[model samples]
Target: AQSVEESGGRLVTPGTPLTLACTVSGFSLNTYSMFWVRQAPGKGLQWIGIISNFGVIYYATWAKGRFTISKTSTTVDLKITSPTTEDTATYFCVRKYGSEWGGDLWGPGTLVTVSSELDMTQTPASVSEPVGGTVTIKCQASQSISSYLAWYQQKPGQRPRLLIYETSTLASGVPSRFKGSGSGTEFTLTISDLECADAATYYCQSTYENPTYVSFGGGTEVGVK
Candidate 1:
């Protein structure tokens, strides 16, 4: 098996079908299967489906009817027929069964934002306070979620940075005051000691892999008061 990478892509709108391709550069196709994984907007990772080297398909239990995985000799594709806001996430194509934990190779993700083509109702608001004041961000899922919540931060123009994973464990080097709590559709990302570096958007995501897949709550913008 071999690996390759590509990026600088385009955006996908809601209600429209999306087709993305991942091409492996340095290896034979016979040695590996290609898989599609997505991190729902502001959420955790989910294994979507796999296309075998010989052209067989195995989708996630939750994805059986909603998504289709296909491939050719050199490239793999993910086709979503009708997308919703819940479908937004970073989509990646990788080698299947590459590790015991699943999905060892990753393509750069495509950030998909669901566009309703209707009136925008949700208001984007933020709250800030002094250095010692506490700020809390609440993340609500469109449906019930398990313990798959994760958090990330993106400064202007920088890549999304992981803050918390699997609900509670802070990713290494994270600040001391940043904490996470709660589960099952309601998750909280708390920052106890507001600092200048904490002025970025906070997002909560779910990783449930059964009848439903991964998703993220609308991001809460954090600002300095």
Candidate 2:
């Protein structure tokens, strides 16, 4: 199967230069483009930038500069100059332009700790319920935050997909059976009608505004009875 192998991450002080590697196999970089996404230790995923096969690329406005993705015959690297605490997150390499070949291909991600971080916790590490019932995953935040929480769903052998964003706001194409709710320090993602497809891992992330904090819940698993 095709996959990507990313470089290991490390901790760096502010204003330090850092570089990350992304190697792809079973496919050609000339035919496919690569992108970068990151998530803080306990936060939701964030798409930071992308690189075209033609060697042209752009980064998100949240971090328009400071880092770049450059391609090489043997390697593609993400270089960050003078990284800060805001850049502390696990960086992943995601591919673009695919017709659903085993979901999205993504790197396992490497954590780059630029210092300064928060945390989150989720209860009931695993849940087992009857086929006709509902499941609610509870998440707690160490710090109070707004509705910046989001939820994700991930099945085995595939990348996680967005389910809810901005707290209760369901992501595009998300079914009504799923609801993400939160008020300040507490949040929950509930799925109705425990179908066979709902048997997967659900994760929650909260991004707080005060002093820049991004926290993520460990994850809750829904199992069949």
What is the alpha-carbon lDDT for the whole of candidate 2? 0.73
- Among the numbered candidates, top lDDT falls to 2
List candidate 2 stretches off by more than 4 Å.
99-103, 116-130, 134-152, 155-225
lDDT score of residue 75 within candidate 1:
72
Clashing pairs in model 2, backbone N/Cα/C closer than 3 A: 42-215, 42-216, 43-215, 43-216
Which predicted model would earn the best TM-score? 2
Off by over 4 Å in 1: 1-5, 8-124, 142-144, 211-213
Candidate 2, 153-178: lDDT as tens digits: 87754457768767787665788999
Report every candidate's CA lDDT. Answer: 0.64, 0.73
Over the stretch 166-192, how does candidate 1's per-residue lDDT look in tens digits? 667777688769898877666777789
